[PDB]
Amino acid sequence: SVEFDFFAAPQAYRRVAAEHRADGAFHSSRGDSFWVLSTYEGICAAFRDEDTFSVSERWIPLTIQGRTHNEWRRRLAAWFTPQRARDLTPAIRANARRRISAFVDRGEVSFSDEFARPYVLENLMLAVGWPLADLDHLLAINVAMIRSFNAETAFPALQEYVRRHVARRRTEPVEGDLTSATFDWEIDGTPVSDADRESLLTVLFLAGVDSTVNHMANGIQHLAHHPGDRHRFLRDPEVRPAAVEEFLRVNSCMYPGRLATREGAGGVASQGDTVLLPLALANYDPAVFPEPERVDFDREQNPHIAFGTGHHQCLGAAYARAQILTAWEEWHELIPDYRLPDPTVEPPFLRNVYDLRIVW
Numbered sequence: 001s002v003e004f005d006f007f008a009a010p011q012a013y014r015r016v017a018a019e020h021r022a023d024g025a026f027h028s029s030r031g032d033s034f035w036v037l038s039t040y041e042g043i044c045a046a047f048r049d050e051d052t053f054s055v056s057e058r059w060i061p062l063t064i065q066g067r068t069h070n071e072w073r074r075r076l077a078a079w080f081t082p083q084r085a086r087d088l089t090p091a092i093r094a095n096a097r098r099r100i101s102a103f104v105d106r107g108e109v110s111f112s113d114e115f116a117r118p119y120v121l122e123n124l125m126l127a128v129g130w131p132l133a134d135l136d137h138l139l140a141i142n143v144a145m146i147r148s149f150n151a152e153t154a155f156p157a158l159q160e161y162v163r164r165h166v167a168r169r170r171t172e173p174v175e176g177d178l179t180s181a182t183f184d185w186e187i188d189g190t191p192v193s194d195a196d197r198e199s200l201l202t203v204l205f206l207a208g209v210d211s212t213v214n215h216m217a218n219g220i221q222h223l224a225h226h227p228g229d230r231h232r233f234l235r236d237p238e239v240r241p242a243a244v245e246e247f248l249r250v251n252s253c254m255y256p257g258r259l260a261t262r263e264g265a266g267g268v269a270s271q272g273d274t275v276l277l278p279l280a281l282a283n284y285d286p287a288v289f290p291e292p293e294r295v296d297f298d299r300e301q302n303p304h305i306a307f308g309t310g311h312h313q314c315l316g317a318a319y320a321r322a323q324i325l326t327a328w329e330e331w332h333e334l335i336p337d338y339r340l341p342d343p344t345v346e347p348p349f350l351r352n353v354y355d356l357r358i359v360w
């Protein structure tokens, strides 16, 4: 066992795994203790076997499993398809262009604070049906949560907001609006409760901004430091979708948890153990991704699981992809050449509280 803190950065996960993993996992004695799976095949299998690796608070749909979870996903699917993402892409594109245009003349920006976070949140609000006049309010909630408004009142403010949104749509339902649609939903033969409605809307808010923003930021930070890759992205548009997938692989950092239900789970765990599924290890397994630390837009096999796999695979994957690609497209139209302030120091992986300054 090792005294390993699961709040560690991806690089730390990978170093600890390199030194301590055997049989596809290492064990942490920290806190209540937990296993960390370290292989692509083992993590994929765990995501795909909920009878062995359980997800079971009530956060819809993240913490429910079985037939009720499948029914929630069926009801939600229409608002999160690739076709819906395409339908919304002219709005996403105009959003990116408007925002980047407003700071091109400065020659600098704090990428995530001034651009990516309000961009992504605006896009989320459009998809979910939250009035865009509320963006500044919701942005303040989101920022207070990152910087943990403040730690005490941020989440209560979000809870009041979703309660008020439900009440707005119940008074004036809108055809095609997600919240309005849920007033007609049944799950397991029972009308959806306002408590589950509020849970769903809360999960969408908490899931739908930060991961997208930080993938946008870590990707542009790499391009700003690597002129060869920047030039490739700029001059070879056909490679851009592959580049987005390669950055999703490389910049993965979530570590979804599961509860082992049986002896020998994953080859290593026992009944009652917490098991973590770090995407920073799955997506860097050299058995599947040779030279895993290398950003290679031409990587021939990129079966990454940046969005998970199995039944809980990210609902927002198509929408996140559209936002990242579109933002980087519009960025390179207006700002084809750019750099980090000191372009020859190795920058850190961006997570939690950071300030990504780009100049041009």
Ligand code: HEC
Binding pocket: 061, 062, 063, 073, 124, 127, 203, 204, 207, 208, 209, 211, 212, 215, 254, 256, 257, 306, 307, 308, 309, 311, 312, 313, 314, 315, 316, 317, 319, 320
């Ligand atoms: C517009 C909403 C939205 C966006 C954008 C979004 N997500 Fe998700 N994500 C969700 C929801 C909702 C779930 C829960 C799905 C479920 O439990 O069935 C989820 C689940 C996941 C999971 C699985 C967690 C588990 O326990 O299995 C991963 C991993 C994930 N998202 C990664 C990402 C990444 C990476 C991005 C952006 C680069 C992203 N998500 C963007 C809504 C979103």
